[PDB]
């Protein structure tokens, strides 16, 4: 295999299907990423990722180098030998997080100091040492370093922090291309930014088009603008990217932010969503979504969503899910989480063959009317 | 296959090794009952426990009655079919736990009457109430219920105990007999009381042996005496009992605790020592038991034990479980309870396989020499 080939095989209006080639494993897009925090995607075996048809999955930068360290990981044989999941790896560049998570917070044109969140420790991100920190990881996709626009943001913050992001972007390209390993092994996204500004969108997406990267991501959205106005913003955003490059639309989301981000020419998606709110007792089905922690649930004896195809569904009842959820046991978190990832999965496996086939609109409103009902 | 049969195949002294067949399976001993409670053995799927090599899991009648209920197990099918386990489950009374985890608890010859621990509900389990539930869970093997007997108890003490219990244990007969389903299918133990006094112990093992048992438990140990006591009450218990039924020690226990109480005539065990030790960090190896959250472990690529043949130990090092333990993760419960189940079951084939070769003797003195090197 090659170091990336992205291939289009089906198109449908904005929407595609494809692959992505990299030297660990093909990548069928439309994809869904499950989230690993400190590497691991939580309560499953990577096997057990594997199976629900993930082909690909997101490390988290800033947790990685907190705990265990990147530097402690690469001397272990590097993130996929040490979490024991083979195929590729997407990380995240850890600038979010450093402004979710840290304290003590110090930015400049050169990066950013915090402090830790779990001990206090001092620590530093740039864009050449997050670009470092997942060659030590041995990332396969690595996300240049931005800064974060807050939502809302006023056009000059938008502006200002669109254009620093666009000067770190550049730095994140050099940094990863002048280390040979990662350059001919890995591949390099961009990060669009510009807020909901059509105008910020446009510099940022000729920008990154300048510079040329790998795949293009549209950041800064799924921060609390809502459903409306994160399609609005895609719907002028995704055409300025290369369209012969993957889309990717960071921390969304949603089954139905999914199906919309899809119509509107995203190819890759991540979300805690199915993971995190699989442990609290939110489980997904074609009929929307259920809180398992219902009484109603009680005695159900009905497998969680009535069609998945997932181990969960084969095995157990609604009944014992319950129980285990409202037990506290670890058993319900690991059940539940892989049920929702392997939802997900047949969501993307849905897209992805109704794309193929020329039928992703009737699959759109087919899907929201039963989910929604 | 019969609803129970024994047969002991080889004998070295004391020891002895065997099958017992039941109407859901064998079970090869001495044998290993990794603990469910509340319908899940901690951190791992029915399907984990089978592959670990455990022939049959222990349930715990106490949680089970508080929650989900043993009347709603019952109508949704029984224990085996709403946890997934379909192999045969051994059931404890629920008495000790009355004892140890409930609270407003009044005792009578009749039985107990208790506040739950979980909402201040009351209850009430009696030798019928106890042998009822176990009906309801559709457990295989049935344990009478008994009033336990703290250490150190007075000879008073444990006479008065120890005959309630013997009174108990009739009626716990009775009980089980009157219930034809019950009495066709599952399997009924009694528990030998007396605490340290070999006097009552013979006592409560001729009224056991008059009343007649499945199996017999020997009661009331690993309550505190520690191991040369235990050791020295299984000298003179043990023997007491019926050679041609089985003898469990309930609530054993560490692995040479194990070991010694096979050279004793001990043909079963259970306790929760692998499964909550090791979400607590503590794997167990041939060299002894290691923490995996000491900081010697951060580094190193070897498996949890250099021998062990389990699905943890083939694929991830000492480093990567040592980080998850200490990041409180999910997976890290899993893999330290899949290990240290799997170590157990491994401890267990070799003693059966040491028996049935008539080198037990050597195979004791040998795990001895290098556990506690
Ligand atoms: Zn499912
Ligand atoms: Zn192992």
Same mark, same amino acid.
């Given at each position: 295999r090659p170091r990336f080939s992205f291939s289009i095989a089906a198109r449908e209006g904005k929407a595609r299907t494809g692959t992505i080639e990299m030297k660990r494993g093909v990548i069928r897009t439309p994809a869904f990423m499950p989230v690993g925090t400190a590497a691991t995607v939580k309560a499953l075996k990577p096997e057990t990722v594997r199976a629900t048809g993930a082909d690909i999955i997101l490390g988290n930068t800033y947790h990685l180098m907190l705990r265990p360290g990147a530097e402690r990981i690469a001397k272990l044989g590097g993130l996929h030998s040490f979490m024991g999941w083979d195929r590729p790896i997407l990380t995240d560049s850890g600038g979010y997080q450093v402004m979710s998570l840290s304290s003590l917070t110090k930015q400049s044109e050169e990066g950013v100091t915090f402090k830790s969140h779990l001990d206090g420790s001092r620590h530093m991100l740039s864009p050449e040492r997050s670009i470092e920190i997942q060659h030590l990881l041995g990332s396969d996709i690595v996300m240049a370093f931005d800064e974060c626009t807050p939502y809302p943001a006023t056009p000059s913050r938008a502006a200002s922090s669109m254009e620093r992001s666009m000067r770190w972007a550049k730095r994140s390209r050099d940094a990863f291309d002048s280390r040979k390993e990662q350059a001919e092994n890995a591949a390099l996204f961009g990060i669009q930014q510009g807020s909901v500004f059509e105008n910020l969108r446009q510099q940022s997406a000729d920008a990154l088009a300048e510079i040329g990267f790998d795949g293009y991501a549209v950041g800064g =959205? +799924?921060?609390?603008?809502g459903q409306d106005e994160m399609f609005r913003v895609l719907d002028f955003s995704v055409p300025m990217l290369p369209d012969d490059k993957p889309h990717y639309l960071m921390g969304v989301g949603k089954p139905d932010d999914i199906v919309g981000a899809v119509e509107r020419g995203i190819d890759m998606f991540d979300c805690v969503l199915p993971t995190r709110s699989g442990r609290n007792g939110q489980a997904f089905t074609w009929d929307g979504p259920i809180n398992?922690?219902? +009484?109603?649930? @009680?005695?159900? =004896?009905?497998? =969680?969503? @009535?069609?998945?195809?997932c181990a969960v569904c084969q095995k157990w009842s609604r009944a014992f899910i319950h129980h285990l959820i409202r037990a506290g046991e670890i058993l319900g978190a690991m059940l539940m989480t892989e049920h929702n990832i392997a939802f997900y999965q047949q969501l993307m496996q849905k897209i992805r063959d109704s794309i193929s086939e020329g039928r992703f609109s009737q699959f759109a409103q087919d899907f929201r009317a039963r989910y929604f009902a």
């Open positions: =959205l +799924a921060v609390g603008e398992i922690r219902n +009484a109603r649930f @009680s005695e159900d =004896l009905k497998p =969680l969503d @009535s069609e998945c195809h």
